[PDB]
Amino acid sequence: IQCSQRMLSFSDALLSIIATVMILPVTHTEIDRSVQRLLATRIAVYLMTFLIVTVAWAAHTRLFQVVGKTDDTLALLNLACMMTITFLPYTFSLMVTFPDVPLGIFLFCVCVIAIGVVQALIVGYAFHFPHLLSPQIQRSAHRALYRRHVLGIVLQGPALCFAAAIFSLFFVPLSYLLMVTVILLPYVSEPLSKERVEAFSDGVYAIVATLLILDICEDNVPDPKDVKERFSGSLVAALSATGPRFLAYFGSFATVGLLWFAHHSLFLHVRKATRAMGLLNTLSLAFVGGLPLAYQQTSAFARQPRDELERVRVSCTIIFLASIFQLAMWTTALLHQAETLQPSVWFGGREHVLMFAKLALYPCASLLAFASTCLLSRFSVGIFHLMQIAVPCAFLLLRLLVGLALATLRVL
Amino acid sequence: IQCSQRMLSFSDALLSIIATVMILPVTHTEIDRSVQRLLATRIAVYLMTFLIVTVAWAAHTRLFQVVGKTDDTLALLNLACMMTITFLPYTFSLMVTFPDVPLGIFLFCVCVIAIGVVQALIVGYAFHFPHLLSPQIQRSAHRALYRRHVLGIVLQGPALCFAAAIFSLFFVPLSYLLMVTVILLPYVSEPLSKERVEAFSDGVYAIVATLLILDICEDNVPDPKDVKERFSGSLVAALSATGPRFLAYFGSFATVGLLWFAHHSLFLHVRKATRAMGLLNTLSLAFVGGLPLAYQQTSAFARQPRDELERVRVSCTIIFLASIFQLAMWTTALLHQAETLQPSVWFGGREHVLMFAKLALYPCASLLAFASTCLLSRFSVGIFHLMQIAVPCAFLLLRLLVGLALATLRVL
Numbered sequence: 001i002q003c004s005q006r007m008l009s010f011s012d013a014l015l016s017i018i019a020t021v022m023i024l025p026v027t028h029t030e031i032d033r034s035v036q037r038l039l040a041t042r043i044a045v046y047l048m049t050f051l052i053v054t055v056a057w058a059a060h061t062r063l064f065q066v067v068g069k070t071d072d073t074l075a076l077l078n079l080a081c082m083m084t085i086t087f088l089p090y091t092f093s094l095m096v097t098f099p100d101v102p103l104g105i106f107l108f109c110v111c112v113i114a115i116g117v118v119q120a121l122i123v124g125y126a127f128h129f130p131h132l133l134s135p136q137i138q139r140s141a142h143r144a145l146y147r148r149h150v151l152g153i154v155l156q157g158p159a160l161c162f163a164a165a166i167f168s169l170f171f172v173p174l175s176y177l178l179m180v181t182v183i184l185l186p187y188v189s190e191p192l193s194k195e196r197v198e199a200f201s202d203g204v205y206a207i208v209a210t211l212l213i214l215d216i217c218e219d220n221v222p223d224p225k226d227v228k229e230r231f232s233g234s235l236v237a238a239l240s241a242t243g244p245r246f247l248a249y250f251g252s253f254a255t256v257g258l259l260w261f262a263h264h265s266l267f268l269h270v271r272k273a274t275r276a277m278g279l280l281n282t283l284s285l286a287f288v289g290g291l292p293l294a295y296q297q298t299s300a301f302a303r304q305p306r307d308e309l310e311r312v313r314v315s316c317t318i319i320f321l322a323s324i325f326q327l328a329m330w331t332t333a334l335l336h337q338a339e340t341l342q343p344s345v346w347f348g349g350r351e352h353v354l355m356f357a358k359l360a361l362y363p364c365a366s367l368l369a370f371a372s373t374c375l376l377s378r379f380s381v382g383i384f385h386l387m388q389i390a391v392p393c394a395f396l397l398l399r400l401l402v403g404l405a406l407a408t409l410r411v412l
Numbered sequence: 413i414q415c416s417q418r419m420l421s422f423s424d425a426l427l428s429i430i431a432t433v434m435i436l437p438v439t440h441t442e443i444d445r446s447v448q449r450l451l452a453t454r455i456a457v458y459l460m461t462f463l464i465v466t467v468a469w470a471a472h473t474r475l476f477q478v479v480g481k482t483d484d485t486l487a488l489l490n491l492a493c494m495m496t497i498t499f500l501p502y503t504f505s506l507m508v509t510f511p512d513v514p515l516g517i518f519l520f521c522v523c524v525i526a527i528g529v530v531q532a533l534i535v536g537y538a539f540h541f542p543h544l545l546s547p548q549i550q551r552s553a554h555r556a557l558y559r560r561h562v563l564g565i566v567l568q569g570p571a572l573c574f575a576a577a578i579f580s581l582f583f584v585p586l587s588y589l590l591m592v593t594v595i596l597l598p599y600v601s602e603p604l605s606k607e608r609v610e611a612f613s614d615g616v617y618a619i620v621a622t623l624l625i626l627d628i629c630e631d632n633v634p635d636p637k638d639v640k641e642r643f644s645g646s647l648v649a650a651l652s653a654t655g656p657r658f659l660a661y662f663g664s665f666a667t668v669g670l671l672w673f674a675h676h677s678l679f680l681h682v683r684k685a686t687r688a689m690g691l692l693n694t695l696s697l698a699f700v701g702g703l704p705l706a707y708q709q710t711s712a713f714a715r716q717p718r719d720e721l722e723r724v725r726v727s728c729t730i731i732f733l734a735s736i737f738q739l740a741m742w743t744t745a746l747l748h749q750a751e752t753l754q755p756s757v758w759f760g761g762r763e764h765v766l767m768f769a770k771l772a773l774y775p776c777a778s779l780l781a782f783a784s785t786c787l788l789s790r791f792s793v794g795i796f797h798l799m800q801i802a803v804p805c806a807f808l809l810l811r812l813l814v815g816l817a818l819a820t821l822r823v824l
């Protein structure tokens with residue numbers, strides 16, 4: 001019997017890595033209609049894999065809410081569960097690459113079944129040793145009903161996927177129907193641990209922020225032969241062609257760091273996060289993962305000014321979605337502010353307006369940038385760059401801006 | 413004023429990613445003397461970059477031990493510090509690629525100076541607002557002397573690097589001397605936060621464990637055209653050629669997960685980790701990062717049985733080092749067991765022998781495998797595979813094995 005915080009932290013790290021694995025094929029896509037189709041397919045695959053892995057992570061988190069403590073065998077079983085979960089993105093990609101081949105569907109169903117079987121073994125071991133359960137379960141009137149219930153919840157997905165694996169040899173669309181039902185039913189027919197959500201979001205933000213520096217380190221280190229031959233021995237000339245990559249990395253890191261700053265400030269005032277906030281956070285992270293692609297597109301070559309307008313608009317849309325989902329989380333938590341928010345950030349509270357401005361800095365900025373792309377298109381990219389300069393400073397002097405707005409309201 | 417656990421957790425995630433960025437060029441090296449030289453250079457670069465980034469992380473951790481709580485401006489300054497640290501591996505690689513070009517040394521010195529300047533700004537802001545400091549520092553009557561000491565500690569590195577940047581235009585070896593002095597002096601002339609060490613190790617283990625699955629997802633998804641052309645439409649035939657990659661991933665994940673299990677069990681019984689344990693943990697993680705390369709080599713083609721012997725021996729050496737440094741950490745903590753270990757794992761304690769066996773499972777296994785590579789070489793790879801099967805099971809039934817050993821001692 002031992003504490004289980006570090007094991008779940010490791011689980012969150014692994015699950016964030018597995019959720020964000022599928023953004024690498026997107027950011028590595030080369031910048032004609034075939035390229036656009038490939039990019040759309042890769043974006044769709046990334047979104048679906050992120051949603052699936054986040055569903056698996058949510059199931060894991062609400063599984064280990066029941067299993068209070070951990071043990072050596074529980075740690076090994078959790079490691080096995082993590083290994084089985086790590087195959088979700090690759091196997092789903094193989095599935096969607098060959099939709100009419102039953103082998104891909106069979107492999108996806110087998111992966112989901114393996115995850116469910118390991119989780120069922122974990123639950124069975126936990127209930128066989130009651131000291132590992134949470135005190136509420138350890139004391140529950142009918143503890144074994146909770147088992148009959150947790151086994152059903154855990155094994156519902158494996159059963160539907162097993163039936164889908166059956167139907168893949170006879171009727172593939174039916175396999176698709178039950179496979180989508182696996183993810184649909186738990187939400188279409190409860191609080192989520194705030195520590196797990198915080199750790200998953202921190203992992204996702206850390207991974208997304210440092211994608212471009214990883215890529216630059218892997219590829220964009222100048223080669224001495226090319227330095228002495230293409231750039232005539234001038235290392236600064238060699239690094240000049242790499243400059244757009246550095247600018248894209250700086251922009252992506254600044255944006256993702258500021259979004260994480262807003263998220264961190266939001267969650268420092270959350271007492272307990274409902275699953276609606278969990279869904280909104282999942283959507284926010286899914287759209288945050290697309291920021292490096294937007295920055296790569298904007299920093300890329302501009303064949304025509306219309307291409308620059310389109311890329312600036314796309315980047316603004318991605319930023320707007322990624323931040324508006326955080327704003328939606330904040331409003332949803334405000335709806336139940338009695339039990340979800342600290343007294344400081346309640347309606348009319350001390351920090352209410354400050355937090356509102358902190359979470360609305362980015363959506364409004366993206367909205368005005370997108371509006372300028374249609375009204376002041378001649379300066380579009382310029383104002384976009386101005387935004388990249390304005391937003392961090394607005395974060396630096398947010399309290400001063402809020403005080404100025406309060407004074408303006410006071411004199412009005 | 414707000415709590416600073418999540419900000420430091422994000423910092424640990426970013427720093428682990430930055431520390432482990434440089435193993436990707438190693439695991440992408442495909443395996444005549446030119447290839448060996450390239451692999452040796454890449455391994456040396458990875459080790460040096462990992463050591464440098466771990467030094468930066470240690471400086472950050474012992475910086476934010478002084479700065480107790482955090483604020484909005486402190487969070488933004490920490491983000492800037494993280495961004496400046498993210499350029500250490502790339503700039504060091506550019507430095508070592510062009511040793512005689514002063515530009516690389518100048519860029520490395522500039523990066524270190526920027527990190528130091530941001531940290532000095534953080535310290536100055538913290539001391540200007542005393543409520544952000546730790547209570548020890550807050551109640552101290554020598555706050556000015558404390559500020560002077562932390563400014564000196566933070567800015568020592570920037571000054572030496574600035575002088576090295578001066579000497580790069582006049583005497584490059586002198587720049588090398590002061591640049592190595594930057595890392596040498598703080599250790600050649602104190603406890604380290606256990607949470608920070610745990611988070612950094614968890615990040616490193618999660619990154620190293622899932623390298624091969626990331627690579628497989630990026631590259632090893634079969635292409636429909638090649639599936640229908642090179643494998644005559646047989647998807648199982650296409651996946652068969654990918655099988656060695658899956659085996660290497662399974663082996664690497666199993667080993668890294670078991671090493672993390674031993675590390676987690678070790679640190680669940682640590683009251684406070686001294687910096688000697690920090691150095692040993694740094695070495696252990698540095699050698700853990702080489703496991704995917706060893707597994708890739710072993711799973712690769714065997715041109716000659718001698719090549720298989722050499723690759724098995726290299727993998728065994730890497731595993732032995734990665735686990736023997738954990739064992740050395742455990743023994744060092746046992747030296748000061750009064751203040752570093754819980755009473756259960758003291759000499760003659762309840763869990764002492766169990767933890768000893770848990771941390772010595774892997775070093776002894778690697779040692780016997782390496783010995784068999786010289787005594788029973790005919791079966792070498794076989795016993796190596798047997799080890800990959802034996803060690804996890806030994807972890808599953810470790811308590812039973814320890815009880816059997818205790819009974820054997822009892823009857824003796």
Ligand SMILES: CCCC[C@@]1(C2CCCCC2)Cc2cc(OCCCc3nnn[nH]3)c(F)c(F)c2C1=O
Nearest residue numbers: 247250251254257258385388389392393488491492
């Ligand atoms: C207060 C201003 C500087 C703060 C900032 C920190 C603020 C806290 C979070 C981490 C990032 C942010 C920021 C933004 C940048 O955007 C510029 C895009 C390139 C470009 N070149 N021309 N137009 N755009 C940025 F470039 C930065 F370098 C930095 C930093 O170091």
Ligand SMILES: CCCC[C@@]1(C2CCCCC2)Cc2cc(OCCCc3nnn[nH]3)c(F)c(F)c2C1=O
Nearest residue numbers: 076077079080662663665666669797800801804805
């Ligand atoms: C209990 C035995 C299996 C445990 C293990 C899990 C147990 C929970 C913690 C993480 C590891 C580990 C493991 C190791 C493997 O490597 C052996 C290569 C075989 C081979 N080599 N060459 N031909 N065949 C392994 F292969 C596994 F499949 C599994 C698993 O599923």
Ligand SMILES: CC(C)CCC[C@@H](C)[C@H]1CC[C@H]2[C@@H]3CC=C4C[C@@H](O)CC[C@]4(C)[C@H]3CC[C@]12C
Nearest residue numbers: 110113116151152155156157158159160162163
């Ligand atoms: C054979 C391998 C590949 C997969 C095995 C999956 C099958 C055997 C497992 C996975 C989930 C399981 C099901 C989970 C849910 C229920 C509801 C319960 O009231 C009756 C048993 C039943 C119907 C289980 C039967 C067996 C089951 C379908």
Ligand SMILES: CC(C)CCC[C@@H](C)[C@H]1CC[C@H]2[C@@H]3CC=C4C[C@@H](O)CC[C@]4(C)[C@H]3CC[C@]12C
Nearest residue numbers: 522525528563564567568569570571572574575
């Ligand atoms: C090229 C530019 C950007 C780099 C600037 C770094 C230089 C100017 C800074 C960085 C660290 C600084 C030094 C670190 C601290 C001390 C100790 C103090 O008792 C005297 C000043 C002195 C010696 C500082 C002088 C200026 C210094 C060397």
Ligand SMILES: Cc1ccc(-c2ccc(F)cc2COc2ccc(CCC(=O)O)cc2)cc1
Nearest residue numbers: 116117118119120121122123124125147151155
């Ligand atoms: C209803 C059902 C469905 C599927 C499986 C199954 C089948 C194969 C497999 F590999 C693993 C499992 C799941 O692993 C366990 C599940 C439950 C239990 C405890 C139950 C009790 O106490 O009666 C222990 C282990 C079992 C029961």
Ligand SMILES: Cc1ccc(-c2ccc(F)cc2COc2ccc(CCC(=O)O)cc2)cc1
Nearest residue numbers: 528529530532533534535536537559560563567
């Ligand atoms: C001696 C020295 C060394 C380096 C710099 C320097 C220079 C540029 C820069 F951007 C930041 C810094 C460092 O930033 C601070 C330094 C000190 C203080 C506290 C005041 C005190 O007691 O000296 C607060 C912040 C300045 C003085």
Ligand SMILES: [K+]
Nearest residue numbers: 218219437440
């Ligand atoms: K590459």
Ligand SMILES: [K+]
Nearest residue numbers: 017207429619
């Ligand atoms: K990574």
Ligand SMILES: [K+]
Nearest residue numbers: 024214436626
């Ligand atoms: K990668």
